[PDB]
Amino acid sequence: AKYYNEPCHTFNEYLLIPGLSTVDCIPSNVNLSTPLVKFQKGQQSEINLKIPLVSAIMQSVSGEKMAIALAREGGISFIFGSQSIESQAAMVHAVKNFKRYLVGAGINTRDFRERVPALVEAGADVLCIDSSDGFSEWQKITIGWIRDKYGDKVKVGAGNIVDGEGFRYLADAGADFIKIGIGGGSICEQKGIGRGQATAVIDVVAERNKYFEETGIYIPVCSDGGIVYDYHMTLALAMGADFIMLGRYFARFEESPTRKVTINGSVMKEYWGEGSSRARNWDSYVPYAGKLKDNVEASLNKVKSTMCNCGALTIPQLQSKAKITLVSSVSIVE
Amino acid sequence: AKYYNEPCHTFNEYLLIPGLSTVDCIPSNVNLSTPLVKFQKGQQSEINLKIPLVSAIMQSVSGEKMAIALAREGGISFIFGSQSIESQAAMVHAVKNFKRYLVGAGINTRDFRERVPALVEAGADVLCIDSSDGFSEWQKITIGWIRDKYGDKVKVGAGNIVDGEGFRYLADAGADFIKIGIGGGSICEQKGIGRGQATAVIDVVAERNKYFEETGIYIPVCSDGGIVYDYHMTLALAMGADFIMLGRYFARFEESPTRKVTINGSVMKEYWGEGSSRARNWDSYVPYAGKLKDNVEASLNKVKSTMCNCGALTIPQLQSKAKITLVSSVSIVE
Amino acid sequence: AKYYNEPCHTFNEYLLIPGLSTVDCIPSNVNLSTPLVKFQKGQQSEINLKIPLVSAIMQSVSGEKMAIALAREGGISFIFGSQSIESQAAMVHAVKNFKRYLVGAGINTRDFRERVPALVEAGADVLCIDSSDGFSEWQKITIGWIRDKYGDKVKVGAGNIVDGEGFRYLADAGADFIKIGIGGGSICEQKGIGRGQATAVIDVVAERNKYFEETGIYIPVCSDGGIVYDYHMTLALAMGADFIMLGRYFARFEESPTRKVTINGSVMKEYWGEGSSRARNWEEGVDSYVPYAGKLKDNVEASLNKVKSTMCNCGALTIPQLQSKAKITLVSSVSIVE
Amino acid sequence: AKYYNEPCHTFNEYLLIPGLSTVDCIPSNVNLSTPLVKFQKGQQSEINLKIPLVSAIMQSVSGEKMAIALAREGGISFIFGSQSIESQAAMVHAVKNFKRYLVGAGINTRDFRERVPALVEAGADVLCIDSSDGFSEWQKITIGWIRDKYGDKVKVGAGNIVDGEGFRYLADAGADFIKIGIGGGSICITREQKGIGRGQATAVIDVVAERNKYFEETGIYIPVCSDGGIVYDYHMTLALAMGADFIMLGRYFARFEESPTRKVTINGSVMKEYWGEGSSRARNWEGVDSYVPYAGKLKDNVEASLNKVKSTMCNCGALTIPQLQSKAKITLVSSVSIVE
Numbered sequence A, B: 001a002k003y004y005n006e007p008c009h010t011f012n013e014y015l016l017i018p019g020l021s022t023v024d025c026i027p028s029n030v031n032l033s034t035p036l037v038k039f040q041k042g043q044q045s046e047i048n049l050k051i052p053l054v055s056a057i058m059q060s061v062s063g064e065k066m067a068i069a070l071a072r073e074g075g076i077s078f079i080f081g082s083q084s085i086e087s088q089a090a091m092v093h094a095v096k097n098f099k100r101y102l103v104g105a106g107i108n109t110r111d112f113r114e115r116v117p118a119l120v121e122a123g124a125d126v127l128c129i130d131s132s133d134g135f136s137e138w139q140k141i142t143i144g145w146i147r148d149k150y151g152d153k154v155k156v157g158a159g160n161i162v163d164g165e166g167f168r169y170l171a172d173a174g175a176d177f178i179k180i181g182i183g184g185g186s187i188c189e190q191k192g193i194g195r196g197q198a199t200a201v202i203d204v205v206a207e208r209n210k211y212f213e214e215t216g217i218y219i220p221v222c223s224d225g226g227i228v229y230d231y232h233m234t235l236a237l238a239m240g241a242d243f244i245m246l247g248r249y250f251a252r253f254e255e256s257p258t259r260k261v262t263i264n265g266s267v268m269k270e271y272w273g274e275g276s277s278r279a280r281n282w283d284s285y286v287p288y289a290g291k292l293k294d295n296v297e298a299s300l301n302k303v304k305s306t307m308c309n310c311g312a313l314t315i316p317q318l319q320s321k322a323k324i325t326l327v328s329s330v331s332i333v334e
Numbered sequence C: 001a002k003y004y005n006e007p008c009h010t011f012n013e014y015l016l017i018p019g020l021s022t023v024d025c026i027p028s029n030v031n032l033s034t035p036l037v038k039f040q041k042g043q044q045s046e047i048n049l050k051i052p053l054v055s056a057i058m059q060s061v062s063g064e065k066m067a068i069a070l071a072r073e074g075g076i077s078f079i080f081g082s083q084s085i086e087s088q089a090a091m092v093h094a095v096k097n098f099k100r101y102l103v104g105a106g107i108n109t110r111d112f113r114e115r116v117p118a119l120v121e122a123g124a125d126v127l128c129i130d131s132s133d134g135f136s137e138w139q140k141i142t143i144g145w146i147r148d149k150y151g152d153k154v155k156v157g158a159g160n161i162v163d164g165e166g167f168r169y170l171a172d173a174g175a176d177f178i179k180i181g182i183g184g185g186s187i188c189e190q191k192g193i194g195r196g197q198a199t200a201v202i203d204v205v206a207e208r209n210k211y212f213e214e215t216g217i218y219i220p221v222c223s224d225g226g227i228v229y230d231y232h233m234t235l236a237l238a239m240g241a242d243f244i245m246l247g248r249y250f251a252r253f254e255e256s257p258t259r260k261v262t263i264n265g266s267v268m269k270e271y272w273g274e275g276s277s278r279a280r281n282w283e284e285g286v287d288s289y290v291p292y293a294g295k296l297k298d299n300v301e302a303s304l305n306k307v308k309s310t311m312c313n314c315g316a317l318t319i320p321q322l323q324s325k326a327k328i329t330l331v332s333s334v335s336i337v338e
Numbered sequence D: 001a002k003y004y005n006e007p008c009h010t011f012n013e014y015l016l017i018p019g020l021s022t023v024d025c026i027p028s029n030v031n032l033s034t035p036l037v038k039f040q041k042g043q044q045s046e047i048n049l050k051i052p053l054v055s056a057i058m059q060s061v062s063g064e065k066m067a068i069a070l071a072r073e074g075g076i077s078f079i080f081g082s083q084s085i086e087s088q089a090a091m092v093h094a095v096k097n098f099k100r101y102l103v104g105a106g107i108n109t110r111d112f113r114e115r116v117p118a119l120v121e122a123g124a125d126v127l128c129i130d131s132s133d134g135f136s137e138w139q140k141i142t143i144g145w146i147r148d149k150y151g152d153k154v155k156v157g158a159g160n161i162v163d164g165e166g167f168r169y170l171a172d173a174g175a176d177f178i179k180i181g182i183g184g185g186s187i188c189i190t191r192e193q194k195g196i197g198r199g200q201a202t203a204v205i206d207v208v209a210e211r212n213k214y215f216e217e218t219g220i221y222i223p224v225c226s227d228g229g230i231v232y233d234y235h236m237t238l239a240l241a242m243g244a245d246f247i248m249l250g251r252y253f254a255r256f257e258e259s260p261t262r263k264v265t266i267n268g269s270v271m272k273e274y275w276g277e278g279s280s281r282a283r284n285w286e287g288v289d290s291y292v293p294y295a296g297k298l299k300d301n302v303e304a305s306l307n308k309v310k311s312t313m314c315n316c317g318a319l320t321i322p323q324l325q326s327k328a329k330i331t332l333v334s335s336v337s338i339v340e
């Protein structure tokens, strides 16, 4: 078997060390745009978000309201695929025909032959294979089928890998963007598979950067899961992630499709995992945080502020200049 | 004194990182058979289990019912030896002439001269010297006696060492399989001897493989104790263990020779250690879990599924392909 | 991005290993004076404190009474700047004209143009640019303006950096002393910037000593925040810090400008961060309560006697000797988690 | 300042890995004797203990009863010096003329000119300078006075250091044995006061290495004592395996009937008093005051502990302490493992 020369780490084990902040670096001048899909060197991505946040492919988070709300702020949602092809297709259509908003859709490696056409006809701007382990022939086959039928006209995100090898496989398979994260989810012990979210992102980004140099193709990567604090967003971006996928964070908003409940005088909101027995056959609570616009605005202002402490006016600048340190276990145990 | 460059670790400190899962790797195609006794390169072991689980050499777990139930599922039990030579021989016989089922039996380094013949005559398929410290002349003497009288016809497992040095000694002594594990057991501080189960397995396996390349003799090793969760099974196997010995896991079952009791409305089963003042002169409660068949089925289904995430259809494949990472203490401390 | 070969640590992760104690090293002979502002090789700083303690630039700790009480013990306070220029200047004046006591003042990188002249006129002995991130052109600009107008006549501390790069920048910019500390404060998660206080001090100090070899200029550094126990003082000094800035420690005293409240039988004092909403509007911080400890004098005396005693276990009669002779070891997380 | 390439550790962070146990390595064949004072190569120590256990220099543990009981088991006690010279001297005399028993006495760097002569006259077999920081001129001066007046006739242990530098200094001053341990005692708040100390295991390991170098350099073997930090019996085996010739314990002995403290019932539990020598009461004839569980007679406890130690030694394939120190395989354990 193969072992590693060092243990994996989570976002909570790192801190950013300030760099030179110039007079022109004010939060208001910070550009949070980022590429969603792969593009060739010297060119621009066919799809660019204004903000680096995307909502999780979950019944408890990415519904119509969320897709529209998040799209309005510059992000994009991936309508959960744990429902019938018609339902999803409809939701996608609804978002597109609201008055245009970008919308994504999750797909599986089983019914893609009939699921993809529907989503495409429905107007989905981008798809993403949904899996806890994307390092497999099924994703290669699924992605290959899509290229076979739509060429580069259909954008499909892929996987969920945690190392260079997994990244490499999906990159060669054709994926437009690759998703990172196994076990870091807040609602994730069972199979004993996973890796610290921070280490997974750092390792995958290094591989992605090599790949770019080798092929001239820049494949955006998404840090999926593990975001507990706003500053985790800044760390994920600083470590190389182009955009971030969150579930819990969004589940707490008014726009999520879960019901608002009250527990012990506190207004909560339901939130369950896609791997739970209820979604797979198409569980917990999170504090109600209010409207998406208000929250997203706050989190990103904090992100923008921090970027300037690091001397960065753009995400690529941050990824280049960021100084990141590990923190001792005792420091965290405070 | 001799010191080590790194601290020893437990199974809870590791995670498996997915490998390439080919379309044909589905739980129903995974072969969980594994060798029980040493054989020559290129050949096969004389004894091969259908599943890599064996029950502990303890009064509270390996009785007649356990031996039959587990053998049915494809594993094997080592009838406890903290009882008269006549009693133990009786059990071995009952199991053998039930209607054939393989059964093991534990022996000690004191009365082996009469215990082994009785056990052998009763039809025991394999023996195992039972000790908390197999790194001793007594085990070498015992194996030497069995060889003197039966040559290679009687298979004898041996030890319980936690490093390459102990493994090498027992290998050269002639052991058919070597058991790993000191201080990792659930019901185990007193003498300050032991090692993290994970490091012990990793270290002994490395030595076992060197021995293989040097002699062409592959000696199976058993990871004994320390299994808290099902995923720990996959890890032990991935680290090189050919089979796993468990006590607590099996004590919880209906087939264990202990009585079922009720404590606070919760049905429990008695479970005490072989080092306790009662087994030696021939303690706690574990939750009742039901039938062995149903539990073993669920655990191994998880193991099979995980093996496929790792791209392995067989145990030897898992041991070769497995990517294993250490986890930060902060991560575990969650 | 740039990564570090080792995790940062806090003061609670270190212990001092004793050195040779001489017959004459007794607390009563230990000299605790330390330099406040940069000076050249072989020389003496123009401002030397009798004790290495200074109070934080916070509304909840450095008011007029604190300034007088701490100056009396040999230290110095930095009157908070989260108030109008007239009020702060008034405070400085009252301290200087009490009956003379040294006093400092915090300034910002925004209104320094008129804030500095007023504070200087009011009689402030030293100023300090107050910020959670001093690694910025604004600090260089502020010091530049000051040097342009008063040359070396006005002493100004600067920053709050946590690494050699930050120090080097502020040093070249002209700072009279550089303050270390981001995220180690007791009332500090949000932006995720910072570094363990011990590592920050150790790294900045190493850079400060290199700078000294290169330029012949010694720049005193201040370990700001993170002091929980008295022995943390000795450690901070041992690691290279010339003086220590504290907020919580002093807020607990009778002389702090905050009111006293009773929380379940215990007498407490209010203590809120300057990054909180209320101070900025004259949220990097919180609003808490620290146990009332009594008079500054008694407490400081108790803490320092502890420091002096430890210094002698280390074989040092002076702070510079300590920084030179100290044997410092990291302790296992298990040892701490006891 | 000076820093270290690695963090210090406590005894709880180590485990022993078995070695080859030969058929003849049985508890009843193990030799636990050990040298108490320095000797020259190829020679033997003028004082050898039958068991590597000595009792702390504390009012709460080393009184007359303790001294007699432990000496009977093959060890030795160091009568506490936080009392008048006449009192301490009387106690020593009592033990020596009980019916002969070896006994030790603690001394300080203040009144030694009058204290040493009295203790020697009373018949003390060995003295030991009692201090929390033995790395000082005062200890060298004290030892220098003793050498001047009695040459090598009077044996005196010294200090309490935690590193090679402190060891070397005391070794050069002329100490007959050196005590290791600062911040490891149970009744200590590992310096929430001064921030001085070092993990006991690392302190013993480091001091031992220097001791062995000093030996190769001078031919003089100086025994070292691991003082404090012993919680479990296996810590005893660890300390010895790490190179300690003998162990000094406070809490361990305080729990016994022979300790000079009172037995008191606390929540149905029979306890015994135990306070540090740096606590306000002993200094007025650093530490805290407390209770420990009553454990009964010293003989029964020391027998059980040492049986366990001997047994473990054989798991490591050692019949003697020097063999253990040579063959022991010691591993650090991950912090996660400890947090179990």
Ligand SMILES: NC(=O)c1csc([C@@H]2O[C@H](COP(=O)(O)CP(=O)(O)OC[C@H]3O[C@@H](n4cnc5c(N)ncnc54)[C@H](O)[C@@H]3O)[C@@H](O)[C@H]2O)n1
Pocket (backbone or CB within 6 Å): A057, A108, A109, A110, A130, A131, A132, A133, A138, A160, A181, A182, A183, A184, A185, A188, A225, A273, A274, A275, A276, B026
């Ligand atoms: N990120 C995480 O760590 C994590 C853990 S669970 C989880 C989420 O939970 C949800 C469920 O994930 P999942 O990976 O179990 C689902 P996925 O569809 O990838 O796999 C389920 C199973 O069906 C089988 N399968 C897939 N495609 C085929 C096919 N074409 N033909 C035959 N068999 C096939 C596979 O062997 C697999 O075991 C996901 O939506 C995901 O976002 N994420």
Ligand SMILES: NC(=O)c1csc([C@@H]2O[C@H](COP(=O)(O)CP(=O)(O)OC[C@H]3O[C@@H](n4cnc5c(N)ncnc54)[C@H](O)[C@@H]3O)[C@@H](O)[C@H]2O)n1
Pocket (backbone or CB within 6 Å): B057, B108, B109, B110, B130, B131, B132, B133, B138, B160, B181, B182, B183, B184, B185, B188, B225, B273, B274, B275, B276
């Ligand atoms: N795996 C563990 O960490 C662990 C701890 S306790 C434990 C279990 O508890 C049970 C008891 O283990 P154990 O090691 O005490 C048993 P073992 O028989 O090995 O030893 C018991 C004692 O008898 C002595 N002895 C053994 N053979 C002889 C002989 N031929 N001549 C003279 N003396 C002899 C040994 O020195 C030993 O002290 C075992 O069944 C084992 O599985 N396992």
Ligand SMILES: NC(=O)c1csc([C@@H]2O[C@H](COP(=O)(O)CP(=O)(O)OC[C@H]3O[C@@H](n4cnc5c(N)ncnc54)[C@H](O)[C@@H]3O)[C@@H](O)[C@H]2O)n1
Pocket (backbone or CB within 6 Å): A026, C057, C108, C109, C110, C130, C131, C132, C133, C138, C160, C181, C182, C183, C184, C185, C188, C194, C225, C273, C274, C275, C276, C284, C285
């Ligand atoms: N040490 C810590 O970790 C820490 C955290 S909060 C904190 C304290 O809280 C208080 C507030 O600190 P702070 O860093 O927010 C203050 P500072 O003045 O440095 O920054 C506040 C904001 O105003 C802007 N700003 C400053 N000067 C100018 C200028 N001249 N022109 C245009 N914009 C400008 C900056 O970009 C910054 O976002 C401080 O007193 C400090 O001691 N310390």
Ligand SMILES: NC(=O)c1csc([C@@H]2O[C@H](COP(=O)(O)CP(=O)(O)OC[C@H]3O[C@@H](n4cnc5c(N)ncnc54)[C@H](O)[C@@H]3O)[C@@H](O)[C@H]2O)n1
Pocket (backbone or CB within 6 Å): C025, C026, D057, D108, D109, D110, D111, D130, D131, D132, D133, D138, D160, D181, D182, D183, D184, D185, D188, D228, D276, D277, D278, D279, D286, D287
């Ligand atoms: N092991 C530990 O970590 C530890 C902590 S406290 C402790 C115990 O508590 C007790 C008290 O220890 P301690 O170190 O305070 C005592 P010690 O006598 O060694 O020191 C007390 C002080 O008096 C001074 N002093 C000593 N001799 C003289 C002299 N001759 N003339 C003038 N001044 C002098 C020294 O400077 C010293 O600071 C000890 O018995 C010890 O066993 N052990």
Ligand SMILES: O=c1[nH]cnc2c1ncn2[C@@H]1O[C@H](COP(=O)(O)O)[C@@H](O)[C@H]1O
Pocket (backbone or CB within 6 Å): A056, A057, A058, A181, A183, A184, A185, A186, A187, A188, A224, A225, A226, A227, A245, A246, A247, A248, A249, A272, A273, A274, A275, A276
């Ligand atoms: O049932 C589940 N178990 C574990 N992870 C899940 C499950 N459902 C979704 N996830 C993952 O975790 C993310 C959510 O992360 P979160 O933002 O920490 O709640 C999703 O995008 C998935 O990758």
Ligand SMILES: O=c1[nH]cnc2c1ncn2[C@@H]1O[C@H](COP(=O)(O)O)[C@@H](O)[C@H]1O
Pocket (backbone or CB within 6 Å): B056, B057, B058, B181, B184, B185, B186, B187, B188, B224, B225, B226, B227, B245, B246, B247, B248, B249, B272, B273, B274, B275, B276
């Ligand atoms: O009394 C005992 N103390 C410690 N370990 C024991 C004892 N009896 C058996 N064991 C060991 O621990 C295993 C049990 O591991 P478990 O499955 O974690 O309960 C056995 O096979 C033995 O190797």
Ligand SMILES: O=c1[nH]cnc2c1ncn2[C@@H]1O[C@H](COP(=O)(O)O)[C@@H](O)[C@H]1O
Pocket (backbone or CB within 6 Å): C056, C057, C058, C181, C183, C184, C185, C186, C187, C188, C224, C225, C226, C227, C245, C246, C247, C248, C249, C272, C273, C274, C275, C276, C283, C284, C285, C286
């Ligand atoms: O609002 C705030 N948040 C975090 N730190 C603060 C804040 N206000 C002041 N500080 C810092 O922390 C120090 C106080 O540290 P303390 O002594 O640990 O309470 C000050 O000198 C500042 O550098």
Ligand SMILES: O=c1[nH]cnc2c1ncn2[C@@H]1O[C@H](COP(=O)(O)O)[C@@H](O)[C@H]1O
Pocket (backbone or CB within 6 Å): D056, D057, D058, D181, D184, D185, D186, D187, D188, D189, D227, D228, D229, D230, D248, D249, D250, D251, D252, D275, D276, D277, D278, D279, D286, D287, D288
């Ligand atoms: O008051 C005290 N504080 C801290 N340590 C003490 C004190 N009194 C004695 N000691 C030390 O700690 C040992 C006790 O160790 P213990 O066996 O862990 O209780 C003694 O031999 C001393 O070296």
Ligand SMILES: CCCCCCCCO[C@@H]1O[C@H](CO)[C@@H](O)[C@H](O)[C@H]1O
Pocket (backbone or CB within 6 Å): C109, C110, C111, C113, C145
């Ligand atoms: C040579 C003198 C330089 C003085 C520098 C003053 C910097 C004050 O700061 C400036 O204040 C303005 C008014 O609030 C703002 O609009 C600017 O954005 C801000 O940078």
Ligand SMILES: CCCCCCCCO[C@@H]1O[C@H](CO)[C@@H](O)[C@H](O)[C@H]1O
Pocket (backbone or CB within 6 Å): C110, C111, C112, C113, C114
């Ligand atoms: C090239 C960009 C120059 C920006 C300089 C803006 C200066 C704004 O003006 C400044 O505002 C400060 C705050 O009120 C005052 O203290 C200064 O005296 C004043 O000059």
Ligand SMILES: [K+]
Pocket (backbone or CB within 6 Å): A018, A019, A020, A021, A308, A309, A310, A311, C133, C134, C135, C136
């Ligand atoms: K900055």
Ligand SMILES: [K+]
Pocket (backbone or CB within 6 Å): A133, A134, A135, A136, B018, B019, B020, B021, B308, B309, B310, B311
């Ligand atoms: K896979």
Ligand SMILES: [K+]
Pocket (backbone or CB within 6 Å): C018, C019, C020, C021, C312, C313, C314, C315, D133, D134, D135, D136
């Ligand atoms: K000293």
Ligand SMILES: [K+]
Pocket (backbone or CB within 6 Å): B133, B134, B135, B136, D018, D019, D020, D021, D314, D315, D316, D317
């Ligand atoms: K052994």
